[PDB]
């Protein structure tokens, strides 16, 4: 899909779910519902190159408004992993979430090499 990496975050959601949720998710109902609800805020029909840090500042405010502060941190938590995969794919050069405090909490380890 797309020419090579010029797809939207809405399409990236399919990729992200199939890649990052195939690694370590443990809670499918949580991660899946996140995707359609808040992970695609409004700029879903927009690309990853367009989501500058200030957009994250806006969506963090939006998610607290349209939802709760709890999920705001939840979404941001997944976004980090998303940007990480985006950068290793070289869709973007930076971590738009780095304009804020992304904390840590969530990584896990290896065993040899994830086969898929």
Q: What is the DSSP letter of 98?
A: G
Structure tokens, 17: 């779910």
In whole angstroms, what separates CA 33 from the centre of its chain?
Answer: 13
Structure tokens, 106: 């969530």
The structural domain count of the chain equals 1
Beta bridge partners of 47: 8
Is the CB of residue 76 less than 8 Å from the CB of residue 57? no
Task: Report in angstroms the alpha-carbon separations of 57 from 34, 91, 96, 109.
Answer: 18, 21, 10, 31
Q: Give dist(CA 10, CA 43) in Å, integer.
A: 8
Structure tokens, 86: 């985006």
Range of the domain at 25: 1-116
Q: Give dist(CA 107, CA 57) in Å, integer.
A: 24
The domain that holds 56 is classified in CATH as 1.10.150.130
Q: Give dist(CA 69, CA 5) in Å, integer.
A: 32
Q: Give dist(CA 24, CA 94) in Å, integer.
A: 23
Method: NMR
Structure tokens, 8: 């939207």
């Amino acid at each position: 899909m797309a020419e090579k990496n010029a797809y939207t975050v809405a399409q990236l959601a399919d990729e992200y779910f199939e890649r990052m949720i195939a690694g370590r998710w443990k809670h499918p109902n949580i991660v899946r519902s996140r995707i359609e609800k808040d992970i695609k805020p409004a700029i879903g029909s927009l690309k990853v190159e367009d989501v500058k840090p200030r957009h994250i500042d806006d969506v963090l405010k939006a998610v607290m408004k349209r939802g709760a502060p709890s999920i705001a941190n939840d979404t941001l938590r997944w976004l980090k992993r998303m940007f990480n995969y985006a950068i290793k794919r070289h869709i973007i050069e930076y971590n738009p979430a780095a304009a804020f405090d992304p904390g840590d909490a969530g990584g896990k380890l290896e065993h040899h090499h994830h086969h898929h």
